[PDB]
Each structure stands twice: as structure tokens, then as C-alpha cells.
Enzyme design. Sequence first.
Site, PDB file in Angstrom:
ATOM      1  N   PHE A 187       7.480  14.771  -3.038  1.00  0.00           N
ATOM      2  CA  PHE A 187       7.532  14.274  -4.420  1.00  0.00           C
ATOM      3  C   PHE A 187       6.352  13.344  -4.731  1.00  0.00           C
ATOM      4  O   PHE A 187       6.528  12.267  -5.310  1.00  0.00           O
ATOM      5  CB  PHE A 187       8.845  13.522  -4.698  1.00  0.00           C
ATOM      6  CG  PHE A 187      10.050  14.394  -5.033  1.00  0.00           C
ATOM      7  CD1 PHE A 187       9.923  15.720  -5.389  1.00  0.00           C
ATOM      8  CD2 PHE A 187      11.326  13.826  -5.029  1.00  0.00           C
ATOM      9  CE1 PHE A 187      11.062  16.491  -5.708  1.00  0.00           C
ATOM     10  CE2 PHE A 187      12.459  14.576  -5.356  1.00  0.00           C
ATOM     11  CZ  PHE A 187      12.320  15.922  -5.681  1.00  0.00           C
ATOM     12  N   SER A 198      15.425  19.359  -3.057  1.00  0.00           N
ATOM     13  CA  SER A 198      14.217  19.237  -2.239  1.00  0.00           C
ATOM     14  C   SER A 198      14.603  18.895  -0.804  1.00  0.00           C
ATOM     15  O   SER A 198      15.403  17.975  -0.584  1.00  0.00           O
ATOM     16  CB  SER A 198      13.284  18.158  -2.770  1.00  0.00           C
ATOM     17  OG  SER A 198      12.270  17.894  -1.804  1.00  0.00           O
ATOM     18  N   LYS A 218      19.037  22.785 -10.052  1.00  0.00           N
ATOM     19  CA  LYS A 218      18.334  23.603  -9.064  1.00  0.00           C
ATOM     20  C   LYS A 218      18.924  23.366  -7.679  1.00  0.00           C
ATOM     21  O   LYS A 218      18.986  22.222  -7.215  1.00  0.00           O
ATOM     22  CB  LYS A 218      16.833  23.269  -9.043  1.00  0.00           C
ATOM     23  CG  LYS A 218      16.017  24.228  -8.136  1.00  0.00           C
ATOM     24  CD  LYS A 218      14.508  24.143  -8.442  1.00  0.00           C
ATOM     25  CE  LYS A 218      13.673  25.044  -7.497  1.00  0.00           C
ATOM     26  NZ  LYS A 218      12.209  24.878  -7.863  1.00  0.00           N
ATOM     27  N   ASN A 270      12.710  17.399   1.229  1.00  0.00           N
ATOM     28  CA  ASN A 270      11.641  16.509   1.677  1.00  0.00           C
ATOM     29  C   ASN A 270      11.854  15.069   1.230  1.00  0.00           C
ATOM     30  O   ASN A 270      10.927  14.251   1.333  1.00  0.00           O
ATOM     31  CB  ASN A 270      10.300  17.033   1.157  1.00  0.00           C
ATOM     32  CG  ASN A 270       9.931  18.354   1.793  1.00  0.00           C
ATOM     33  OD1 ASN A 270       9.368  19.241   1.141  1.00  0.00           O
ATOM     34  ND2 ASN A 270      10.294  18.516   3.063  1.00  0.00           N
ATOM     35  N   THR A 271      13.047  14.742   0.742  1.00  0.00           N
ATOM     36  CA  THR A 271      13.416  13.381   0.367  1.00  0.00           C
ATOM     37  C   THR A 271      14.743  13.063   1.040  1.00  0.00           C
ATOM     38  O   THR A 271      15.714  13.812   0.884  1.00  0.00           O
ATOM     39  CB  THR A 271      13.506  13.233  -1.157  1.00  0.00           C
ATOM     40  OG1 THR A 271      12.180  13.193  -1.700  1.00  0.00           O
ATOM     41  CG2 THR A 271      14.246  11.949  -1.548  1.00  0.00           C
ATOM     42  N   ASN A 319      15.587  26.662  -4.361  1.00  0.00           N
ATOM     43  CA  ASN A 319      14.484  25.887  -3.799  1.00  0.00           C
ATOM     44  C   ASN A 319      14.070  26.507  -2.447  1.00  0.00           C
ATOM     45  O   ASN A 319      14.520  27.596  -2.067  1.00  0.00           O
ATOM     46  CB  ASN A 319      14.938  24.433  -3.680  1.00  0.00           C
ATOM     47  CG  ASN A 319      13.798  23.441  -3.840  1.00  0.00           C
ATOM     48  OD1 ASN A 319      12.692  23.613  -3.298  1.00  0.00           O
ATOM     49  ND2 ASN A 319      14.048  22.419  -4.658  1.00  0.00           N
ATOM     50  N   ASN A 369       5.934  23.425   3.180  1.00  0.00           N
ATOM     51  CA  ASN A 369       5.404  22.195   2.596  1.00  0.00           C
ATOM     52  C   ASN A 369       6.373  21.029   2.785  1.00  0.00           C
ATOM     53  O   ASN A 369       7.604  21.192   2.770  1.00  0.00           O
ATOM     54  CB  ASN A 369       5.092  22.389   1.089  1.00  0.00           C
ATOM     55  CG  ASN A 369       6.306  22.139   0.217  1.00  0.00           C
ATOM     56  OD1 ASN A 369       6.588  20.998  -0.164  1.00  0.00           O
ATOM     57  ND2 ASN A 369       7.059  23.206  -0.075  1.00  0.00           N
TER      58      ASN A 369
HETATM   59  C1  LIG Z   1       3.832  23.599  -2.213  1.00  0.00           C
HETATM   60  C2  LIG Z   1       5.151  23.663  -2.938  1.00  0.00           C
HETATM   61  C3  LIG Z   1       5.584  22.586  -3.709  1.00  0.00           C
HETATM   62  C4  LIG Z   1       6.808  22.640  -4.389  1.00  0.00           C
HETATM   63  N1  LIG Z   1       7.247  21.565  -5.156  1.00  0.00           N
HETATM   64  C5  LIG Z   1       8.451  21.645  -5.841  1.00  0.00           C
HETATM   65  C6  LIG Z   1       8.886  20.578  -6.647  1.00  0.00           C
HETATM   66  O1  LIG Z   1       8.211  19.543  -6.808  1.00  0.00           O
HETATM   67  N2  LIG Z   1      10.091  20.681  -7.286  1.00  0.00           N
HETATM   68  C7  LIG Z   1      10.893  21.805  -7.172  1.00  0.00           C
HETATM   69  O2  LIG Z   1      11.962  21.850  -7.770  1.00  0.00           O
HETATM   70  N3  LIG Z   1      10.474  22.866  -6.407  1.00  0.00           N
HETATM   71  C8  LIG Z   1       9.263  22.788  -5.725  1.00  0.00           C
HETATM   72  N4  LIG Z   1       8.837  23.859  -4.961  1.00  0.00           N
HETATM   73  C9  LIG Z   1       9.716  25.067  -4.831  1.00  0.00           C
HETATM   74  C10 LIG Z   1       9.377  26.224  -5.770  1.00  0.00           C
HETATM   75  O3  LIG Z   1       9.576  25.750  -7.098  1.00  0.00           O
HETATM   76  C11 LIG Z   1      10.264  27.448  -5.482  1.00  0.00           C
HETATM   77  O4  LIG Z   1      11.619  27.063  -5.705  1.00  0.00           O
HETATM   78  C12 LIG Z   1      10.135  27.963  -4.046  1.00  0.00           C
HETATM   79  O5  LIG Z   1       8.829  27.767  -3.524  1.00  0.00           O
HETATM   80  C13 LIG Z   1      10.469  29.460  -3.911  1.00  0.00           C
HETATM   81  O6  LIG Z   1       9.632  30.272  -4.711  1.00  0.00           O
HETATM   82  P1  LIG Z   1       8.377  31.081  -4.071  1.00  0.00           P
HETATM   83  O7  LIG Z   1       8.878  31.803  -2.839  1.00  0.00           O
HETATM   84  O8  LIG Z   1       7.933  32.093  -5.099  1.00  0.00           O
HETATM   85  O9  LIG Z   1       7.255  30.092  -3.760  1.00  0.00           O
HETATM   86  C14 LIG Z   1       7.612  23.781  -4.281  1.00  0.00           C
HETATM   87  C15 LIG Z   1       7.173  24.849  -3.510  1.00  0.00           C
HETATM   88  C16 LIG Z   1       5.957  24.798  -2.839  1.00  0.00           C
HETATM   89  C17 LIG Z   1       5.551  25.999  -2.031  1.00  0.00           C
HETATM   90  O1  LIG Z   2       7.946  18.116  -1.104  1.00  0.00           O
HETATM   91  C1  LIG Z   2       8.173  18.370  -2.288  1.00  0.00           C
HETATM   92  O2  LIG Z   2       7.701  17.679  -3.274  1.00  0.00           O
HETATM   93  C2  LIG Z   2       9.046  19.527  -2.582  1.00  0.00           C
HETATM   94  C3  LIG Z   2       8.922  20.648  -1.855  1.00  0.00           C
HETATM   95  C4  LIG Z   2       9.789  21.735  -2.063  1.00  0.00           C
HETATM   96  O3  LIG Z   2       9.741  22.796  -1.437  1.00  0.00           O
HETATM   97  N1  LIG Z   2      10.753  21.559  -3.042  1.00  0.00           N
HETATM   98  C5  LIG Z   2      10.929  20.435  -3.800  1.00  0.00           C
HETATM   99  O4  LIG Z   2      11.826  20.356  -4.657  1.00  0.00           O
HETATM  100  N2  LIG Z   2      10.037  19.400  -3.543  1.00  0.00           N
END
Ligand SMILES: Cc1cc2nc3c(=O)[nH]c(=O)nc-3n(C[C@H](O)[C@H](O)[C@H](O)COP(=O)(O)O)c2cc1C
Ligand SMILES: O=C(O)c1cc(=O)[nH]c(=O)[nH]1
EC number: 1.3.5.2
Length: 366
Positions: A119, A185, A225, A187-188, A254, A115
Site C-alpha cells: 500500500f 490485500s 473486494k 501485504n498489510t 485479489n 508483489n
Molecule cells: C503489482 C500489483 C499491485 C497491486 N495492487 C493492488 C492494490 O493496491 N489494490 C487492490 O485492490 N489490488 C491490487 N492488486 C491486485 C489486482 O488488482 C488484481 O486483483 C490481481 O492482480 C489479479 O488480476 P491479474 O491476474 O490480472 O493481475 C495488485 C496486483 C499487482 C500485480
Molecule cells: O501490496 C499491495 O499494495 C497490494 C498487493 C496486492 O496484490 N493486492 C493489494 O490489494 N495490495
Amino acid sequence: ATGDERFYAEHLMPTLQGLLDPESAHRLAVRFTSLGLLPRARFQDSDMLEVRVLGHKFRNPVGIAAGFDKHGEAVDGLYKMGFGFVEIGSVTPKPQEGNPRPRVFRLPEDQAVINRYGFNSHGLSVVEHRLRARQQKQAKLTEDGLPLGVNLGKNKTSVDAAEDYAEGVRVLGPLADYLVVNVSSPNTAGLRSLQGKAELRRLLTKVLQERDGLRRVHRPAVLVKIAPDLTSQDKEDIASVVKELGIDGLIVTNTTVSRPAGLQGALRSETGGLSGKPLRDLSTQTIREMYALTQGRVPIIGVGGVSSGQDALEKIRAGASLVQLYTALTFWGPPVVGKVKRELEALLKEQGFGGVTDAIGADHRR
Ligand SMILES: Cc1cc2nc3c(=O)[nH]c(=O)nc-3n(C[C@H](O)[C@H](O)[C@H](O)COP(=O)(O)O)c2cc1C
Ligand SMILES: O=C(O)c1cc(=O)[nH]c(=O)[nH]1
Ligand SMILES: Cc1cc(NC(=O)c2c(O)nn3ccccc23)c(C(C)C)cc1Oc1ccncc1
């Protein structure tokens, strides 16, 4: 049931994912979850799954990770699927749209997602009012062992990162059991560089000062995190700052900007953070390292590639007090939550642990 797990896993979710691209599917899932509508899950949490950490009781150690309910719209529906705690966000100070589409991709052959949402956020004011409308309900849920976390981000065009996070502490801190400073993240632009030593110490000093200024019953724990892609030097520096300042905990990890050898999905070379099974052991090893660098004295929430009781227990034995999952819910549906809890309880008993608390960090004591 294993029959319910099988129906979701082999028929319902494969069919819906074939009809809906991942961002549309994500939006529909959140909207549907927010309606309640569905009964509470069958599994009944036993006493050996309870954990006391971060100043709170957790009825079970399996949470929903940040990024599923980005704007605080589905909290109660998530408790109904059996999560022991819910983390919303990331939330930015002002509303913003995130990256252009498409920005989410499935890798079914790898049980993974990539992804680059960027944000996308309704912003602090909208989320503040959403949480205020259920604040007393959440107070009872927390007292009954179902706490709420809020994950804070920063705006794309912001000039002072520390002030963005300070605003989040002041606005949503009073509504949270714990806050997460998300400096990881992928992505920023420039966000992960906030993980360096000097920047991190100054940022976290300001965040903790703001937190300490809140009234006592509105004072949350503060966690950081971190990414799975840090150097050894980066990890020793984070551990040093965390202990110096008294940070309350760490969330590990993350998503990864690495692409492990062996990925099969057609979309493996899309830009973004990779989640799910290819991340699992990279995250577990980062938990192991951070537990050792902090002498076991700093609570860790372990996250990355969890979809079974074995996945959860491996992170707990490596040093996690709690775990979270996200990607596995997108492939297997709600039944995965009870499956993880049922398998975890059975493994604890087979390995001679009295409960989750006894297994935390056990690998380090062999
Ligand atoms: C689509 C998507 C959006 C995410 N958005 C955030 C986010 O806004 N903030 C954050 O701290 N982590 C975000 N994450 C990360 C998850 O919180 C997690 O740290 C990571 O996906 C690993 O866990 P998983 O393998 O069970 O998905 C996002 C992950 C995915 C897949
Ligand atoms: O694009 C985001 O908002 C996003 C994705 C991701 O994997 N982790 C995160 O902290 N933010
Ligand atoms: C739990 C769940 C999740 C999803 N889907 C996603 O959330 C999803 C996805 O498919 N891909 N994806 C990629 C990145 C991020 C998210 C996602 C779907 C889709 C297939 C309709 C159904 C779900 O079933 C429910 C929901 C609410 N109440 C009861 C049952």
C-alpha cells in the site's frame, strides 16, 4: 493488429523487461501512459459488448484492475488503450511508503507476478486534488460509458480500520462512480481478518452510512473486494452480510498467498500475493461460488489471470458482469486489451449469445 500484438509480445516487451526490474518498469509505464502521447487504440467497441450495471453504462466490460495506477496519475491514458472502465488505488488516508525494496518479482515461465508493495500511496489529499483537476472531463466520460472506480485502503499504523475507510468515502466518494473496500490485500498485517463476519458487518455498516450521507449526484456504488484464499465458511458469511446490508457488488479476486503446485519461476518462494495465469481458475471458481451464494442478485467484477477472450467469457459465464486484468498487460503490452475484446466478441457469436449481458451466469442455467 495481430502484427502489433506480435511485435509487442515477442520483441518490444521482452526486450524492455530484460533491461528494467519490475518496479522501475511499472513506474516508467505509468509515467509514459500519463503523457498521452500515443493515439487511441484501433479496436471499435460493438454494441454487443455494452453492459449496464452498478447504475452506469460500460461501453465494454474489460477494465484495468487496481494497483497499476495507484495514485490516479494515468486515467485518461488508460481509457486511450481501450479499457471500458478504470480503477485507481488502493489509496490510504495519509501518504505512506510501503514495504522496503525489492518488493515486486516476475515469474516469466509461469506468466505470473508476485508483489509485496504494501500500500505505497500518495494519500487521499493528493489523489483528491488530482481527480478534481479533471472532474468534469470524467463526468462526460462516464456519461459516454467510461466509468471510474476508486479503491480504498488503510494505513499501516492506523488504530481504527473502519475510520480509515470512512475517511476515504468522504474524500474520494464524491469523485467516484464506484468505491471498493479492499479488505483482501495480503501485504498489510491483519487486513484480511476484516473479512470475518462480525468485523465485516460493523465495518460495512459504517462505510454505507457515510456513502448515504453524500449528495445524490456524488453518491457512488460500494463494492467489497475479496481474497481467493477464503474458507467455505468465510464465503457464506460474506454473502450473508452483503445481502443483509445491501452492498452493491463484489470484486473477485485479489492476489493469492497460496503457491499452486507446478510453479517454475526461480522467485516462486518470495513472500507476497501471486497474480496472473496460476491464479486464473482459482478466481473463476470463487466467482462461481459467490454468484450462487448471492442468488445471482449481486453484480460481480471478475479478476485474476485474464489474458484472452476465452478467459473473460469463462468468468462472465461463471457469474461476472464485468472483468478486469493487470498482469497480462505487464507481459503483452497495450495490444492485449483489443485482443481480449476481439476474441470475446467472436466467442459470444459462436456460442449463440446476443451480447455480454445474455452470457452473465449462463453456466448456472445449464
Ligand atoms: C503489482 C500489483 C499491485 C497491486 N495492487 C493492488 C492494490 O493496491 N489494490 C487492490 O485492490 N489490488 C491490487 N492488486 C491486485 C489486482 O488488482 C488484481 O486483483 C490481481 O492482480 C489479479 O488480476 P491479474 O491476474 O490480472 O493481475 C495488485 C496486483 C499487482 C500485480
Ligand atoms: O501490496 C499491495 O499494495 C497490494 C498487493 C496486492 O496484490 N493486492 C493489494 O490489494 N495490495
Ligand atoms: C503497458 C506497459 C507496461 C510495462 N511494464 C509494467 O507495467 C510492468 C512490468 O514490466 N513488470 N511489472 C510488474 C508489476 C507491475 C507492473 C509491471 C512496460 C515496461 C516493460 C516498460 C511497458 C508497457 O507499455 C506501454 C506503456 C505505456 N504506453 C504504451 C506502452
